[model samples]
Target chain A: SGFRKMAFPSGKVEGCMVQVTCGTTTLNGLWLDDVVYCPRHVICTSEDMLNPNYEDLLIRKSNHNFLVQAGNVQLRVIGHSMQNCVLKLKVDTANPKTPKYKFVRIQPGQTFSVLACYNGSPSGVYQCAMRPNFTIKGSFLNGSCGSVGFNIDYDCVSFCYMHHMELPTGVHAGTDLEGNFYGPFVDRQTAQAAGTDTTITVNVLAWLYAAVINGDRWFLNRFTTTLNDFNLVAMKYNYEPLTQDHVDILGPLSAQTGIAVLDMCASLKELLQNGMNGRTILGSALLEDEFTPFDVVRQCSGVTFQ
Target chain B: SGFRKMAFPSGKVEGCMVQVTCGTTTLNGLWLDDVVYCPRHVICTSEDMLNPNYEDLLIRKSNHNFLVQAGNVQLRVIGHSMQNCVLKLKVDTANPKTPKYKFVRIQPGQTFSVLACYNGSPSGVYQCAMRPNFTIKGSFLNGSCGSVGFNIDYDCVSFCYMHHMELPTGVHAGTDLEGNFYGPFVDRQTAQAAGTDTTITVNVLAWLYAAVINGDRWFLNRFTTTLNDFNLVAMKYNYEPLTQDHVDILGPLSAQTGIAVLDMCASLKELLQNGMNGRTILGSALLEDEFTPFDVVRQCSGVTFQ
Candidate 1:
C-alpha cells in the first residue's frame, strides 16, 4: 500500500501527469536535479522539504589520493527498518570513471568504513563490485560496499615539490620561495638518500592537447569556451595507456628540478633584453634564443599533457 | 581665484583632488567608497536610453547603449541666464596612436558626441592629457561618472573585437564569416587578368615575452595564460644553440595549430561516412578525432566533462 510522491518547490515534474505503481501506499521518485539547491532562489520561497536527506559531498584531490567524502551517505537505516532488503546508494558526475559514491550496509545500526584502493592509473567508470570500496563495510547481516566512478586527472608525472618538499619520497630537501627544490647533490643515489617529496599536480590535461589531433591545421581560435574552468593551472593526465608517455617522462626529473611556471615560460624576453630577441632566436648568433624556445617547450609539455 | 575644484563620486582622484580654500559651497566631497558612478560610466550606462541627461544617471551592463545614444549631459542651473562656460570630453581608454578623441569642447545645449574608441591593446593604460585640463566656470559644471575607480582589473582589456587577426606588422584584419575582400590577379603577358574576392582568416603570430619581475616567478603560468587567452598554438621557432653541437636540425614546423573551442563540430554518427581514411599523419589513429580535437575541448576535457 503506497501513497502519492510529494516533492518540494511546487513544480510538478510529471508526464503532464505521472502515474506511479508501487507495492505499498508510500512511494517516492527522485531526479538528479533534486540534489541541487539554487542559492538565489533559496529565500522567501515557501518550499516544503519533507524528510529530505543531504550530504555535503566534498571531492578532494591531494598529491597521491583523489577522493570523494560523502559525509552521511554511509549510514545505516535510521529512517527506515528493513531486513535483508538491500540499501543501494548511487552518485554521478561529468567524469564517469571517477565514481561519485561510497556505500555501506548493516543490520539496522551496524557501522563500517570504506577504503577504496585501485591501480591509480585507469580513470573512468569505476563500477561498484559486490566487493568493498574505500574503507570497509562490517555488518550483522553481510552487505559489501561498492565502487565509486571517477576520472583520475593526475598525469602522475613527478613534480619536485618546490613548495612542500617533505613528502613520502623525502627527495627534496626543502622548498624555496617560489617552491623550487635547489640541490647540490652529486648523483641520483645521494639525492634519494637525503629523500624527496615532490608534488605532481594530477589534473586533467586533454584541454591543451588539441594540437596533437588538429596537428598542422589547428587554428588558434579553437580554445574559446573549451576550458572547463580556467583558474586551475596544474599539469594533468590519467595514468592510462594513452597517458603512459607522459608518466614515463616525469620519472627522471625531480627534487633538484621542481616543476613551476618556469617550465611554462618560452619567453622572447631573453633575446630582446638588449634588443629584438626574435631575430636572434630565428638566426642570429644566439640561434637558440631562450626567450621563445617553444619547440623544447612543446616537446616537454606534450610529454606532460599527451 | 583658485575656487576651481573637481568633484567625483569617489571623493577626488588622488593627486587630481581639487581643494577649495575660499568657498562655502562649490563642490560637495564624498568618499571613494560612496561613489557609485563616474563620467565614462555615466556615458556608458545611458548609451541605450532615448537621451540620457541629468534626470537619468545610472546605467548597468544589462541596459542597452543608451548613454552613447543620448550624447548629452543635463545640467542643474539656478538661473536661465547661465552661460559662457567650457567643458571638454576625453576618454581614459583612448590612445594617441588611434587618436579616438582629442579634448572636444562641450558648450551649454551643444550636444557633443561622446566618442570612446578603444583602438590600442587593452593591456595598456590610458590617462587623458588635458593639453590644458581647462575647466569651465559655471554652476555645478565639473563632471564625474563611474561606479568605481577605473577598475583595478586590467582584465577589462577594453573589450577588443576578438575577430581581428593582429599580424606581426601591426596589421589587424577582421575575419567574420561575412567579410568581403577583392584581390587583383594578373596573368602573364596580358593573357588574362582576374579580380577575385576570397575570405581569409587574418592570423597573427604574436610574440609573448615573459618577464618574471617583482616576485612574479610563475612566468610559465603567466605566459601560458596569455597564450590560452590569445589562442596561441603550434608556435613556430628554430631549435639550434640548445644543442651541444651548434647544428640547426628542425628550422620551422607548425608544431600544433591553435583552434578555438567554439569550432563547429558535426555529428558523431558521421564518423563512418566522413572519417579520416587511416591518415598516417593522424597521431591517435582515431578517424574523426580531428573533428573534436583537443583545442575543441573545454579545460582538460577528453571523454569527460561533456
Candidate 2:
C-alpha cells in the first residue's frame, strides 16, 4: 500500500479515509498507516455493532471500466486480475493557463500514493492542491476506498515532500529538489534560481513559506519524507558512517539561514574526494529525534561539540 | 571598395543592389557608388558617353563569393583582395528551431556579408526568415571578404557580432557605449562573472528594445559586416598601454568583449586604481543623441529624473 496517515503530536487519530470499489459494489474502510483495509468486518459477539449503523459488506476485485478526472491531471485503472492492473496517468497542457493534473499511483502492498508536489509559488503553496480522483470499477469504497470518487488529505502538505534545487542545471530548469515524494535538490542558491526565468520564482517562494517557514502539521510532515530521499541517495552510493570532518563542514551550513550552494559543493566534494556514498553525509546531521531546523540549532551550534 | 550607401543628412546617393548565385558561367558587375562605373567597351561612345545615365563598367577578377540575407539584421562588405577568398563561418543546431549559424566569409574587396541575428520571440522570427541561401564559391573572403549576396536586415537580430553568453563575466559589460551596430553587452556575462543575477535584466531588456530598438543607423550598420573577433585572450598580452586595475578587474571582460582577451597579470590592475576608462564606467549616462525614454513627469507625483 502506498498511502499512509501520519502520526500527529496530538488530536483524535480517526486517520485517513479509503473507498474501494469492486463488481458494482463499493466498500468503505479506514486508512491506518499503509494499506486501506476495508469491508470492515465486525464480530456478532458485540451486539452494539448490530445497531442500525452497522452494514455488512466485503470488497472484491472487479472487471469494469471508468475514468477518474481531477484538477489538471487524471488517472485511470483498467484490466486488473490477481495480477497487476493497468494504471495510466495523463495531463493536458493545451491551455497553458488553467493547466492541472498530478502525480498518482498505487504502489506495491496496495499502497496508494497520491500526488505530493505543489502547484503554486512559494507564497501561494497554501493556495493550491494537487488532488486526483482514484477511479476504479464499481462503488464499494468510493468514499474511503472509492472506485469512482476523489479523496484528499485535508492537510496533505503535512505529509507531502519539498522539492530541492541544486546545480549542474541548465538555463530553463524548474522545481529541482528531491523530497519524500520527489528526488534530491530543489532549493535555489538565489530565490530566483529555483528554475526558469519566469514562474519559478513564484514556485520557490511558495515552498519557502509553506514548507520551510510554516509550522503547520501538514508542512512539518515533509521533514520525514525529505529524510527518505536523503537516505536513499546516501545509501545507494554506500556513504555510511560518515566522518567527523564531514559533520564539521556541514554543521555550520545546516545551522545557517541562507546556504551558499557553491560552498556546500566544495565541502561535499572534498569530503568525498577519495570515495563517495549516498545519504550518510546528510544522515550524520540527524542522530537526534525528528531532524527539524531546530536540530541544526542544537547540533550545529558551538555548544554541541561533545 | 566593399562597403556602400549610408543615409547621411545631405546625401542623394542611389545605392548598390545585387543578386548572387552559388555557381555560374560568366559574372558581370556594374558597381554604382561615389563613382558609377559601367562597361566601357561600347559601340561608338562619343555622343552616348555625354548622357547622364551612361557609366562604364570595370572588369574585376573572379575567384570570389559571399552570401547575404537580411530583414531585421544587416550585413555589408569591406576591404578587397585578388587571391583565394575568405571562406569560413557557419551555424549548426539540430531541428534548426534555434539552429545557430555563425557569420561567415568575405568577397572581392570584402564585398559580401550576411544578416546574422534574430528578432522578436520564436514564432515571429521563425515565420519571417532564415533565407541567406549561401550563394557563393571559392576559398575567398570568408571572414571579412567572402562574396555572395546583398542581404536583408530581414528581422534577424544582427551579425553585429553576438557575444555568446559564457561564464566569468562581471558587473559591467559592453558595447557599453550603446553603439549603432552591436550591443550593451548582449551576451550573458559568463565571460565576466557568471553569477550576480541582477542588472542583467537591464542589460537584456535594453537590447531587446534598443538593438531591437533604435533604427538609428549605427546599430543597423552592424548587421552589415563587423571585424573578425579581436578579443580572444589567447592573442593579446597587454593592450592597456598602461594598469593593474586593468588586469585585476578588467582582464576577464575586456579580454572577451574587445581586447583580443589576454593576460596583463599585474600592470593594468594597479594602473586602473589611479584612473579609469570612459564608457567602461557607463559614460555616466549619454549626454547627447539617443537619450529617448519618456522619464515620467513629477518627482514625488511619481515622476522625473532631473
Candidate 3:
C-alpha cells in the first residue's frame, strides 16, 4: 500500500527504487516526479543540489520534455534517447546564469578546436574556435549537441594566421578582460611570405611586445636569456653576429638576416648599461629616440601602419 | 803585433784581453778604442753590430766620453757608469731615429709611470706617464738617469683621471697612429664624484664608443656578453632590472641605478631584433636616433663638450 506523508524526505535518496517500464523492459528504479533514475545512482533533489559540489547526472529517460524542480534546483531535460538527451544544469553554480551546459575558460592569444554533434549527428561542425575572450571554439544550443569535446592549441599565442593580404580586423593592441595586454597580433602568413628572416624578426618583435606591453615576465626573460646565451658564444669565439656559425645557431631565418641576433644583443647591452627603463619602450619618440618598436615591427613584418 | 792585414779578422772577438784599471781594481778586459768591455764578453765592432740581432752591450769603463766607430757602425758611450750608462744605438733598426735608449710601445688611453734617477739621484721624478703614441711613461734624455725602469698598469684603458675640474688637453676622441680610436678619455675623478651609478653609465658609454667608434671587437663583445649574462638571470627569476637582488649581482652601482642593466638589455634586444648595425652607433642622430654616445658620456660624466 502507498502511504502519503505531510512532508517530503529532507535528505538525498540513495539506493531507493520503484518499478518503472522503458520500451519493452521492466526494471525497478528510483523515480523523481516523472523522471526515472537507474539503481545505484544517488538522487539529490534538495536545493543544496544547486551547489557546484553536486555531480552532473545523465538523463537516461524522461517523460516528454520536463523540468524537474526540487526547492531552488531546476533541471531541464529533453525527451529523446538519440544520445542527444539535453540536460540544462548550471555548470558554475556560484554565478547563476541561464541553465545551459555551455561553458569554457580561455584567454587571449589561445585557440580551441571543437568536435560537436547536432541532434546526435555530426553536422554543422567547426574547428579552431577563438574569441579574444573566455569562449569555446564551436557554437552550442541547449539540446543541440548529442556530444561535444574539445582540445586546445597554444602555438598561436598573440598571433593569427593570415590568408593572402587580409589582416585580422577588430583587434587592437591592448589588455584583455583578464588584464593582460595582447594582440596588435602579427599575421603569420605575412611573416612567412616575407621569408625566415622576416619571420624571426616578427617573432622577436612579438616577444618584445609581450614582455614590455603585457609585462609578461616569462617572455621578457626568455628573450633576454636567449640573447645572452648567444652573446656568450659570439664573444668567446670572437664571432660577429653576422657570422655563419652564429646565425646558424639562432635558426635558419636568423642566418638570412645576418645581424638580427647579434645586433639585438649589442643594442640591449648598451641600453642596459645606460640605465634604460625596461617597462617603457626604449625606441619611442617620447623617449627621444627616432625609431619606435612599431616602426621596426612594421619594417620587419611588412605590415603597414598609419 | 795586432793582425790588421787588409781587414781585421772578420769575426767578433771573444775572450780578448787588454789591461784596464777602475777606481783601484785592475782587470783584464777587451778594448775597443778607449772603451773597456769586461772579459768573457763578445765585442763586435763590425757594421753588423748595428743589427738588432746583436744584444745590447754594457759600457763598463770608458776614457771620458767616447764614440767608437768601426766601418759603418757607431756606438756612443757615456764616460761614467752609475748603472746609468747611456748607449746611443738604434733600438729599431728598420726605421732609424735619433740614437737614444728611450723607446716604449704604448697606445692611446694607456698611462705609464716612470722612476728615473737624474745624474745618479732620484730627483724630479714623475709617475703615471702616458702619451697618445708609442712612448714609455717617463721622460728620459740621453744619459739623464743613473738608472730607469718601469712597470705598466692597464686599469685605465681609454680613460684618463680628471684632476679637479681640469680636463685633459690635446686628447681628442680619435684613433691613434696605430689605427685604433682611443680617446675622448673620460676623467675618472668626475665619474667618481658623480657616484657609482654615473660611473657605471660612463663606463658603458665608453664601451659603446670603443665598440662602435673604434671598431673594437673585444670591448664590444665583453659589453654584450656581460649584459646577456645579467639578462638571463633577470628573466629566469622574474626579476626586473630595478629589483634589488638583480641590481646587486651587476655591482654596487648597478643597485643604485635600477634600470641601467635591464634597460640596456631591453633596448639592445629591441635594436638587434630590428637589425641594427653593431659597428655603428645605434643612438646616433645619423642612425636616426636622438642621442649619441658623446651626449650620453657628457651627461653621465658631467663633462661639458662644445
Candidate 4:
C-alpha cells in the first residue's frame, strides 16, 4: 500500500495554520471577519519552535462523557508545538434538556483524555471523524510545525485563531444600554465613579476581542446535546433564574459574521499585549467549554488585569 | 526620632501582640474600635510598634511611583513578605478628623492574611492604594511555610483597609467563580457560553456599601481592574439604567468580570490534589490577585482577627 498522504518534509521554520472545518469538506484559503493575516510564512525550524513552541488546545464540547452534540462549531488552537502534554478541560457550557446533563468539564484533569461528560450523548453509532490529514507534528518543547495535509482538519489562515482577518469569540460580549457589564451602574463614567475605569469603548471592545475571543465556546454549545449553551447553563442553574441579561448576546452575532462587534475581526487580538491584556477570564474547567466568552468587552481600558 | 513615630518591628512570626503606640498625647485602649479593654494592671505590650506577621490586608494607599500627592509622608521602609500592596489615605480613628496617612498594605501574601469583605462601619481609607504586594509564597512547593518579614519599600500592608473577613463582594455564588487572565479556551462551549457558569446569584445595588447587594453595567464594565483575583469573581455591577437583570445575571456578567468567570473558582487554581481538587492554575498570570473570598472566610474562622 502506498503512503496514505504525501509529507512535505522540507518546509521552513515554525509557523501556524488557521482552518474552518464543517462536515467532511475543508474550507481553505478563506479569510475570517476580524482576523489580520500575517503573510510572512516563516518555516518553523525545529530550533525556532523551542521558545514559543507549538501546542493545540483541542476545542470540543459534549453533553455526555463519550459523545456530545455541539454546533456552530468553530475551534481554534494556537501554540507552536505538540507532544507529551497536560490536557485541561474547562467546563462552563450549558444544556437545556436537563440540569446535571448540562455537563461542563468539571473534572477535566480527572477526565484527562477521558470521555465522561458525553455520558448523555449518543455513543455507539457515532463516528470519530476528523478533517483530512488533520494531524501535524511539532516539538512540544521546541520543534517546528510539520506538514498540515489540508484534508480533514487542515485549513491555513497564516495564524491559528485568525484566518488572516477574522475573529471568533467563545461567548460574545454585547453592551447594555450604558455599555458595560457590571451593573446598578452601566456607563463608563458611572463605573469610574465607583472604583472602576471607563466602560467598554469601541477601541477597548475590539482590543478585548483580539486578546480573548475564543472561537471554541460559540461552536461547542451549538452542537452539544442540549437546547443551546445558554439553555444548558440555565438547566444547571437552579438558584438563579435564566434571563436575557445572563447571556453573551454579542457572542452569536460576532461569530455569525465572524467579526468583532466593535471592529473588524483583524483588530480583535490587538488588545492582547497590554499589561491587563489576558488577565481576565473563566476557570479552567469552564474554559474548556466552547461557549465561554473570554473577551473583556465590559469595562474600560485602564483597569488593572491579573 | 523613634523611627517615624510607629513602625513595623524588624521581625515577627506566627502569633504575637504588638505594642499599642501611645504617642505624647496618650489615650485609653478602649478608644480603639476593636481594641479590648485592658484591666488596670493587665499584662500587655504597649510600645505601639506592630508585629510583622499579623493577619489582615493592610493597604497603604498613599505613596506610589506614579501618583503620590504632595505631603510630608515620610518614607516608611516596610519589610518584604508582603503581597497585594496598595496606596491610600486613612484616618487614625483616635484622630479621624486629623487624619494620618502612610503606605498602608493590602493582602500581605502568606503573612498579611485576609479578614472579612466588608469590615463593617468605621472602615479604613483604602484608595486605589499602591499596587497590592506581589509576593508569592505558599507551603505547596515544600510542605511548610518559611519565615517572611514584611520587607518591601512602599509595598507593605503596614496599616489600613483592615477587616476580620474579606471585604463584602456584595454578591454570592452557590459555587465559586474563577478568573482566567491568560485565557486558554479548550473547547467551543466556553467560548459560546462566555458567562454561562458565571451566574449573577448575588446582587449589589444602588450603592456599594460594605455588605450591600445589587449589580450593574458600571461594575460589569470594569471586570479587568478592581478585581485582580484569578479565582472566581462575584461582584454586583451598577446599571446605567438600573435594572434587576444586571444584578443577578451570570453569563453576561463575565464580559466585565473577565474570562475566568466562566469556570468555577475551584477549577481556576493549580490542581494540586486530584479529581475535583486535582486541577492546578498556579503560575497563571490571571492569578495576579492572590486573595479570594474563601480565603477571606477561612482566615476569619477563629475569634476576632484584627
Best by lDDT: 3
In model 2, the runs with Cα more than 4 Å from the true position are: A1-269, A272-306, B1-195, B201-208, B211-306
Report, to 2 decimal places, the DockQ of model 4.
0.01
Q: Which model is ahead, 1 or 2, in terms of TM-score?
A: 2
Who is ahead in DockQ, 1 or 4? 4
Candidate 3 differs from the real structure by a C-alpha RMSD in angstroms, to one decimal, of 36.5
TM-score of each: 0.13, 0.19, 0.17, 0.18
Q: What's each prediction's clash count?
A: 81, 156, 17, 211
1 against 3, candidate with superior TM-score: 3
Error of model 1, residue A239, in angstroms: 25
Docking quality tier of model 1 = incorrect
Off by over 4 Å in 3: A1-306, B1-56, B60-258, B269-299, B302-306
- Candidate order by lDDT, decreasing, is 3, 2, 4, 1
Candidate lDDT values, in order: 0.17, 0.21, 0.28, 0.20
Off by over 4 Å in 1: A1-70, A73-306, B1-306
**Candidate 1 whole-model C-alpha lDDT, 0 to 1:** 0.17
Tens digits of per-residue lDDT for model 3 on B251-287? 4333333335554444444443454555445333222
